[PDB]
Amino acid sequence: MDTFVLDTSVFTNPDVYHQFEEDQLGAIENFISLASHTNANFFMPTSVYYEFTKMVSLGDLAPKFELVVRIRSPRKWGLMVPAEFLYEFIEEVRYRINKGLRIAEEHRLREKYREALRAGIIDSKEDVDVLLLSYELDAILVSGDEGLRKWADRVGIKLIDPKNLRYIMENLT
Amino acid sequence: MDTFVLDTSVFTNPDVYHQFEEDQLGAIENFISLASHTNANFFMPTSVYYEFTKMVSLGDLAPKFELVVRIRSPRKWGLMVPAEFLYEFIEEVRYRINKGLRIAEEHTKEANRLREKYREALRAGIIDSKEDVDVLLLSYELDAILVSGDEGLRKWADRVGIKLIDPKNLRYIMENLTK
Amino acid sequence: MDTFVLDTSVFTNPDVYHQFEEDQLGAIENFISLASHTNANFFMPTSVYYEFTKMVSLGDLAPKFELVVRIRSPRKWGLMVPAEFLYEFIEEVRYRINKGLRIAEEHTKEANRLREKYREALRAGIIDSKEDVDVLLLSYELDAILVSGDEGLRKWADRVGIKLIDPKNLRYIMENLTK
Amino acid sequence: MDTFVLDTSVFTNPDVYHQFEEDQLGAIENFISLASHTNANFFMPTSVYYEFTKMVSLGDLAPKFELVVRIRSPRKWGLMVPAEFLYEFIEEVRYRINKGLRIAEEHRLREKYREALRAGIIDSKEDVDVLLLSYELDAILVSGDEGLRKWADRVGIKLIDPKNLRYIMENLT
């Protein structure tokens, strides 16, 4: 059985969700439908699912989604990880925090600095939840975020072109 | 054979180093003297020792300190550590960035400059979080007792299951461990 | 269950891909077709697949190719590899830098520019060496048969003990392995 | 027994070899002398020893040095190393090669480019020989090169302030 960890970008980036349907809620509905007939496991971190529910009005599709996708918190599960990954992660957060500062520079600036760095911290956390969950399960990471795909590849994690999730699932009935 | 990992706070916080002497470099020398004849192993992470050097002028004490205290990197390869250290790191970089921005506000008013001050406050914020991770990681790896005059770090150690002592008790324990 | 790691050369070198078809995208499609019904596992390192994409327009073949061929990163964590790969890497970056500087000379004469050309020739020189290390490393890790139309890489594989085949024989072996 | 891997800088950087003696050949002679009475092992990679003999006229001190220091080629010994170190090394070579290019830029430029990059390759090789030998033996790396010390620290290798080699050896009779 193939296991897949899904990012929010899967259902919020039209270049990805158009393979299911051009309509966003219909794309998700089609994903849910196909998943229930696919010989595969699907996981999404809890932080990422919280973001997904905050940005898309799922309505009745939420409890349907909760029948096909395992929503898990890799932090609350207490994983062990090689010390080299812990320092790779810190470099990734450092770099993300510096991006947040260059962003605040392009925009007193107190108000702009606090919000740019808070977003960069939250981005870092959700990314690590996605990479830890993939690592723990030895799963295929599916993401429309090229930056997270490069990060997953630096640490050996398996990927697909997220534009081929539907094609892959259909060849896994 | 009791093993200890030392924080900078032990030789920086006067509440902690007064147990050795009121004099700060006298406190360090007394600690060094006790560490010479002991059944105790003493460790400090490399990054923490660097900070120690920057905020204290050891002079001719540095070679003796580097001999009695084993300065090591916790970036070991075959070692597995709890993923909770990534989350501790995130939680601390958050609080230190918030503190850092409050401090760069004050300083820029007393003195462009605010861009350089905010940049400094966060580079320091990261350095301090990574230094705390080095301390907790080296304790975890060596199954050592963490000695820290910093309560924030102690609460974190307790969270991840690291053995602690009241740092005010270090000299009495070192006196026991003398050969 | 025979496992193979493919180089870009197999679908780029016409001496190798002619065994499938004279047509280059027909050769790739025939390979894909054979790989669909086999007791063979096919792998390609992620960095090598990227290069493949840049020098060939697969179009609607890409999703099928990414399904039959497993695109993986050889940056695995618990894995031990021979230190000889560091030395192979050094030896190749040497020769590729030397080649690169000869090529940037020629091109700048036909066309500042030479600073940009030398910079490009070495960034490509590094990329190509790291791509060769990804190929050999993924073979070593999976204990796979390396398939490469590049003789330089074959001599290197033989050095480190990696199993090889004559890449001109890939279609006949794939025909055997069909279910 | 403490094991030590020595860099060339130990005997070519006056800030380091002055602890033995202000005279360079006398500093080496004093090191050799003390080493023979120290309860410790001393190693130097063969590439680094070749550099050391090429830059200092050792004379009769060479065969004396060969009685106290093990000269070993970590490449010819066939080590195994975690895959994460192999990619850390490639980044270090990339960065070293880029330095070599920025150096050639500060100085047709063909002649200057070939020599700057050749030196950067050789620096990279000798550094990795020093770090591999330290890793294999679980040794203390001794080096006056701050860049190599930072590299060794990124990969968990043990260090000393090379200005304290003599003091350390004297407390290890």
Residue numbers in the entry:
A (entry chain A), D (entry chain A): 1 to 107, 125 to 190
B (entry chain B), C (entry chain B): 1 to 111, 124 to 191
Verbatim from the authors:
We sought to better understand the structure and function of Hth1307 using protein crystallography. From the lower molecular weight fraction of Hth1307 discussed above, we first determined the crystal structure of Hth1307 to 2.5 Å as a dimer within the asymmetric unit. The homotetrameric Hth1307 assembly is generated through symmetry by two identical dimers resulting in a dimer of dimers. Each monomer in the Hth1307 dimer consists of a PIN-like metallonuclease domain and a spike helix (SH) domain. The SH domain is a protruding α-helical domain consisting of helices α6 and α7, which substantially contribute to the dimerization interface by forming an extensive four-helical bundle. In the tetramer, two dimers come together in a side-by-side arrangement, where the two dimers are angled at 41°. The tetramer interface is considerably smaller than the dimer interface, with a surface area of 589.5 Å2 between monomers, for a total of 1179.0 Å2 across the entire interface. The 5′ end of the acceptor stem is positioned in the metal active site, and the T and D loops are recognized by the pentatricopeptide repeat domain in PRORP and MRPP3 (32) and the CR-II/CR-III modules in human and bacterial RNP RNase P. This arrangement allows RNase Ps to recognize tRNA structural elements and select substrates through a molecular ruler mechanism. Upon inspection of the electrostatic surface of the tetramer, there is a positively charged region of the SH domain (Fig. S7, (38)) that includes residues R125, R127, K129, and R131, which have been confirmed to be necessary for pre-tRNA processing activity.
One of the first steps of tRNA processing in nearly every organism is the removal of the 5′ leader sequence by ribonuclease P (RNase P). In contrast to other RNase Ps, HARPs consist only of a metallonuclease domain and lack the canonical substrate recognition domain essential in other classes of proteinaceous RNase P. We determined the cryo-EM structure of Aquifex aeolicus HARP (Aq880) and two crystal structures of Hydrogenobacter thermophilus HARP (Hth1307) to reveal that both enzymes form large ring-like assemblies: a dodecamer in Aq880 and a tetradecamer in Hth1307. HARP structures in additional oligomeric states have also been published, including HARP dimers from Planctomyces bacterium and Thermococcus celer and a HARP tetramer from P. bacterium complexed with Escherichia coli pre-tRNAHis. These data all show that a monomer of HARP is a VapC-like endonuclease that consists of a PIN domain-like metallonuclease domain and two protruding α helices, which are thought to be responsible for substrate recognition. The active site is conserved among HARPs and PRORPs, with five negatively charged residues, predominantly aspartate, positioned to coordinate two catalytic magnesium ions.
